[PDB]
Design a protein around this ligand. Structure first.
Ligand SMILES: [Mg+2]
Ligand SMILES: [Mg+2]
Ligand SMILES: [Mg+2]
Ligand SMILES: [Mg+2]
Ligand SMILES: [Mg+2]
Ligand SMILES: [Mg+2]
Ligand SMILES: [Mg+2]
Ligand SMILES: [Mg+2]
Ligand SMILES: [Mg+2]
Ligand SMILES: [Mg+2]
Ligand SMILES: [Mg+2]
Ligand SMILES: [Mg+2]
Ligand SMILES: [Mg+2]
Ligand SMILES: [Mg+2]
Ligand SMILES: [Mg+2]
Ligand SMILES: [Mg+2]
Ligand SMILES: [Mg+2]
Ligand SMILES: [Mg+2]
Ligand SMILES: [Mg+2]
Ligand SMILES: [Mg+2]
Ligand SMILES: [Mg+2]
Ligand SMILES: [Mg+2]
Ligand SMILES: [Mg+2]
Lengths: 105, 201, 207, 86, 125, 64
RNA sequence: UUUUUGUUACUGCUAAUGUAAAAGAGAAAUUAUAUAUGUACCUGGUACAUAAAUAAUCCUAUCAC
RNA sequence: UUGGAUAAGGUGCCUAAAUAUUCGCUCAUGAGAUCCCAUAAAAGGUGUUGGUUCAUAUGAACUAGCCCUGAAAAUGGAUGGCGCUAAAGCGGAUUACCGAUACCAAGCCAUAAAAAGAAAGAAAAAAUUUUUUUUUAGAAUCUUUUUAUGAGUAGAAAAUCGUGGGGU
RNA sequence: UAAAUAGUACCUGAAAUCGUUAAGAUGGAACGGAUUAAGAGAGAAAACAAGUAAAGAGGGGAAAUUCUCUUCUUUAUUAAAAGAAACAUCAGUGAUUAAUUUAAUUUCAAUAAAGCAAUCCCCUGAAAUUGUUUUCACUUUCUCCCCGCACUAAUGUGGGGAAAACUGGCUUUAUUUCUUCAAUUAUUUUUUUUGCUGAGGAAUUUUAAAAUUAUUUGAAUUUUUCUUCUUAUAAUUUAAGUUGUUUCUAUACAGUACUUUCUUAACCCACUCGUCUUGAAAC
């Protein structure tokens, strides 16, 4: 009816880690219809947006974003590692992100 | 895992494999509602599982049993406690995940009219060779003092009758719609009819 | 100009040097010491009459017709304003997804290709950058909240470059509209906007 | 001297030719002989067979005899041991 | 945590607090090297206070610059700030704490004439 | 540089000097891992530590 | 208990905001697993029909004024 | 510090990565689950799976794999937990993947060593061939540039920070 | 009284300990390290605008009289620089998907025609120190016959006996986009989509050389729109460690934006110091 979508959906999982260590430089993302390693490589250069809400106004608005990039896959099941301009807060680990399609090929 | 809420009927699933697939969905963030918990299967003889429960029943805090392990013998609470033992439930996030699960015996109102799914990687028909032994969670819970096995079946009978009538009406509606469809194909511009024909609609 | 290394044939175009830096131990100099640069080499699906979708700006989701390669990488489009509502506009090919459908394959329109090309020679890269005086005139208005919008819209209307561009837009629209409206389903195709529905997965779609 | 970036000595043509003053000739010869072949497709892959008939049929008898002898000796040892068992 | 503005890079911004200074109030936060067997901070156990080391040092080319990107020189009277007329684009002045208001006014109005900047030209006004 | 290649691939008269002229090579870990350094190349198990005659080229192309 | 506008002199105050998750958050027979379900007849049995990579599907969405 | 790729071990959930593939064995009314390491024997089985001999497609003997009996302690408990039998168990094979402060490439700090220097002159930019900005260096334990390296109790040395008082 | 929060328990008046108000947190200890986020307080010395014109108040230096320099306004004119983000180019270091010249190693497979043998064939097996030489077995068919006459798991079947060369095997052509031309190794040449990094700034080694492009002076050979050999001048970079274009901050003077300090969450981790001791979180 209105407000076209033009992106693919995703959920932000935790950080890149082992058992007992953290490494918060990269974050792991899951994409909605992608569940093989070969299909995940399709998205290997796209731009990622994380949009959330606040309670006060900050520049006249109550919404702000944190931008990132898709860097590589995470092995055999269509998960990806993403690098953001700032580290994602850990109070976000089940929220939504937008896997855009801007840098088109 | 991109839905507001999933509804699963557990009739025919093995307890451990189902409990493992639910915990990761809860951790990633997904509401789950589990129904018909009295029809869950386990992969040993009924006597072999009764002995295991008897071992579970005799461990308790010596000085004060009000504390200590609490033995819950309804079938739905058994699955609840088996899932709880696969989550890090002593942090904050892991306690948030445990609260996004709801369990029922039978199939009460809000969910008797919703769509139910199954998990094929936990179905007994695909996972257990046919000459092995297995038991039913309702019988086992009755053997250790649950006392509501009969009433659930009595209610399931009525639910199934109502569902059968609904299905009859649905089939009639679908046929009536198919006739209206097949008539209207003749009254369209021919090229739209070819483009629908080519793509199998 | 071009240099040929290992049989590659990259194209060279001139470039200017602007930034200045400190010298080591007397007065400064200019940093860059090059004089040419390699051209962009766009991808092999950008034609002169294909339909494409805008992804980012105000007209996101709309469909348009690609018109010219603008000698500076980015390219000019028109989704005929008389049909669609999209003016002459400049976009970066990285913000477009281009389909496989070409306007000039319909034999009802193919006989207009030369005249379409003739109008497009006047489209110029400079005519899209707005002059400093217009910038200053618009920004003087910030010193009610409804008169200002109308004033801003009005000041843009007498930029001579805008008028020159309006002329070409109208010429192309009037030339091309009558043959587009003969194909009903195709005109409705150009009048709608693209969107993503569930049950289409974007790594199995071809378009 | 001040150190600079180190250039890839295998993929950078200028430094590759600087270090190996004979690489340009060899690469040119290889490229020429590569193009000649593809320009003669549907006209190559035919002579190969007509000369394979020339020499492979001569080599075939020798190879067949060699492998036949190896298999025969392996069989002889087997029979000699089996009979020794009794 | 690395902080970088232009060419200036800081390799850390938090202080190195003394071990046990949050639990005992007779222990001050100024850093002292832990000595003595069985410490867990001297032995580099994970999860405790870190120790300073020469590896956090700053670039020689940007070691004493302020965010102004100038070095700081502190003056006490007018005659001390005359060597700044030859190097005014690399230095900035700051007035000492114990000079009177009358002296401060003159120092400020001479710094203005020399085209040198004053870091604290708002005090005692 | 081709002269040193010649003297290394064939033990030419100038081999001690050419070889002693070069710094010891410093290599990455291999791209698909090892099998087991504990065991030998000629053991019936996955292993590494033996003399592998011409299979060294495959390994050193992966850890170049 | 329709709706419009907002939560951008002096005592603690006396106008007042939150979110573990909107972007088509679409989908109600039952039953078996070396087989099932629906219809007619007879007291479960005859007879016929239909499913069987069955969400690898179906349904909904742009035609302004 | 930023990237990359590993070791030892792992890939059902706890917990990052295979409910992976491809062959055999096992049913336990006290199964089993790998260095150190956190116990088990002699002697038996008409449980089931392979194999070796002697006897007109049947008897007998023997052998060794998993399973079972031998097998009893004190607060309630431990393959780490849940649990697991078309294994998530035991013996192999083939691939992918995840994983260090160790390995590789690049920046920066310091230590050690090295190549050199004590006979010095103009560079841009903004301004309509006139002005304006910035720089125009030369301290010897000093100034430029290059490479390798960096664990530490008892103990030893250098450089550096601060306090009362005296001369300049 | 200059001052009484200098009132005689009288200069200044720290910490432990307690009172008042405000703001937060709070399922069987509390505080911490790493990393971010949400609030709150404070801030302009880099975190835009030199200069130009007009008027008003001042302060100096030279030659009570004329020049010339500067600070603060108030108006209205005007550049220029800087920091970020996007895209592109190059270089260094990786991932990812499609190929490729020549050769070696018992390879195969298909289409037209004509033949060879019949328990027979390329093979394989059982017999009478290596190469021959003989003997008998090895093929199944939806064909035929006899017996059981429907006996089967089978839209067929158990036992016995025949026929054929359709199928399988082997020769001679003349063929390879009907079809096949594999696999491993040696030796060579490319290719799709993308992550991270940009040290330095050469008054005479950012030169020389090398590569490229367009005119040339001559010889080869591989005989050619990347064929070789700097055997003559010009330019360029692939040489000689990142450059450009647009937009925003913004026509600002501290605002909810930017810098910074506190407070409080999350995710991972974290036993009480000093001492003697082989060994300390130690009952
Ligand atoms: Mg731990
Ligand atoms: Mg934790
Ligand atoms: Mg412009
Ligand atoms: Mg600091
Ligand atoms: Mg000790
Ligand atoms: Mg391994
Ligand atoms: Mg060892
Ligand atoms: Mg690392
Ligand atoms: Mg294992
Ligand atoms: Mg996991
Ligand atoms: Mg017997
Ligand atoms: Mg495990
Ligand atoms: Mg692995
Ligand atoms: Mg040391
Ligand atoms: Mg004293
Ligand atoms: Mg006094
Ligand atoms: Mg209590
Ligand atoms: Mg015949
Ligand atoms: Mg003693
Ligand atoms: Mg000792
Ligand atoms: Mg002792
Ligand atoms: Mg101790
Ligand atoms: Mg003790």
């Amino acid at each position: 009816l209105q407000a076209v979508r033009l992106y693919e959906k995703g959920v932000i999982l935790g950080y890149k880690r082992s058992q007992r260590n953290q490494d918060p430089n990269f974050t792991l993302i899951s994409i909605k219809n992608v569940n093989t390693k070969k299909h995940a490589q399709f998205y290997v250069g796209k731009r990622v947006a994380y949009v959330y809400r606040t309670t006060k106004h900050h520049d006249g608005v109550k919404i702000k974003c944190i931008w990132g990039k898709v860097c590589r896959t995470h092995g055999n099941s269509g998960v990806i590692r993403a690098k953001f301009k700032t580290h994602i807060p850990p109070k976000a680990f089940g929220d939504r992100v937008r896997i855009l399609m801007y840098p088109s090929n | 895992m991109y839905k507001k809420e999933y509804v699963i009927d557990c009739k025919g699933h093995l307890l451990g494999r189902l409990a493992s697939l639910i915990a990761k969905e809860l951790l990633n963030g997904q509401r789950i509602v589990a129904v018909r918990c009295e029809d869950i299967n386990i992969s040993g003889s009924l006597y072999r599982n009764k002995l295991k429960y008897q071992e579970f029943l005799r461990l308790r805090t010596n000085t004060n049993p009000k504390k200590g392990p609490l033995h819950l013998r309804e079938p739905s609470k058994i699955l609840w406690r088996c899932v709880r033992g696969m989550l890090p439930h002593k942090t904050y996030k892991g306690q948030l995940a445990l609260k996004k699960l709801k369990v029922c015996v039978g199939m009460p109102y809000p969910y008797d009219k919703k769509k139910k799914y199954v998990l094929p990687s936990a179905l007994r028909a695909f996972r257990l060779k046919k000459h092995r032994r297995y038991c039913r969670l309702g019988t086992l819970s009755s053997r250790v003092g649950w006392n509501y096995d009969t009433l659930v079946k009595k209610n399931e009978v009525l639910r199934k009758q109502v569902s059968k009538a609904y299905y009859k009406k649905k089939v009639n509606n679908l046929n009536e719609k198919k006739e209206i469809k097949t008539e209207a194909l003749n009254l369209i511009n021919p090229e739209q009819r070819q483009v629908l024909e080519n793509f199998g609609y | 100009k071009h240099y040929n290394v290992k049989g590659k044939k990259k194209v060279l175009v001139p470039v200017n040097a602007k930034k200045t830096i400190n010298k080591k131990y007397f007065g400064r100099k200019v940093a860059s010491k090059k004089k040419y640069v390699v051209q962009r080499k766009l991808r092999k699906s950008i034609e002169v009459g294909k339909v494409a979708i805008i992804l980012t700006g105000k007209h996101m989701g709309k469909r348009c017709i690609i018109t010219k390669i603008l000698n500076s990488g980015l390219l000019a489009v028109v989704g005929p304003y008389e049909i669609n509502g999209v003016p002459l506009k400049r976009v970066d090919s990285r913000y477009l997804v281009v389909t496989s459908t070409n306007i000039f394959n319909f034999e009802n329109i193919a006989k207009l290709k030369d005249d379409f090309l003739n109008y497009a020679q006047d489209i110029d890269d400079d005519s899209f950058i707005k002059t400093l005086e217009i910038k200053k005139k618009q920004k003087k208005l910030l010193k009610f909240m409804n008169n200002v919008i109308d004033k801003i819209k009005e000041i843009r209307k007498e930029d001579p470059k805008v008028q020159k561009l309006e002329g070409i837009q109208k010429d192309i629209g009037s030339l091309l509209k009558p043959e587009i409206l003969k194909n009903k389903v195709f005109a409705h195709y150009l009048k709608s906007k693209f969107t993503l529905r569930n049950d289409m997965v974007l790594h199995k779609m071809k378009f | 001297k001040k150190r600079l970036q180190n250039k890839n000595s295998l993929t950078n043509f200028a430094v590759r030719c600087r270090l190996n003053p004979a690489y340009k000739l060899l690469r040119s010869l290889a490229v020429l002989r590569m193009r000649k072949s593809i320009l003669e497709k549907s006209k190559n892959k035919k002579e190969k067979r007509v000369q394979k008939q020339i020499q492979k049929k001569e080599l075939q008898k020798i190879n067949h005899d060699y492998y036949k002898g190896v298999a025969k000796a392996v069989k002889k040892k087997k029979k000699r041991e089996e009979k020794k068992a009794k | 945590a690395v902080k970088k503005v232009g060419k200036i890079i800081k390799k850390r911004t938090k202080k190195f607090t003394r071990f046990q200074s949050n639990r005992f109030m007779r222990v001050k936060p100024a850093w002292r090297k832990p000595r003595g067997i069985d410490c867990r901070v001297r032995r580099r156990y994970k999860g405790t206070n870190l120790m300073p080391s020469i590896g956090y040092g700053s670039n020689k080319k940007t070691k004493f610059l302020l965010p102004n990107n100038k070095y700081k020189y502190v003056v006490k009277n007018v005659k001390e700030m005359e060597p700044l007329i030859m190097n005014h684009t690399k230095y900035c002045v700051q007035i000492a704490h114990n000079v009177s208001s009358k002296k401060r006014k003159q120092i400020i109005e001479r710094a203005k004439q020399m085209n040198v900047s004053v870091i604290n030209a708002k005090a005692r006004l | 540089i081709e002269d040193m290649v010649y003297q290394l691939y064939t033990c030419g008269p100038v081999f001690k000097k050419v070889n002693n002229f070069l710094w010891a090579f410093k290599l990455k870990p291999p791209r698909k891992g090892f099998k087991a350094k504990r065991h030998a190349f000629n053991e019936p198990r996955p292993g590494d530590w033996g003399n592998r005659e011409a299979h060294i080229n495959e390994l050193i192309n992966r850890m170049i």
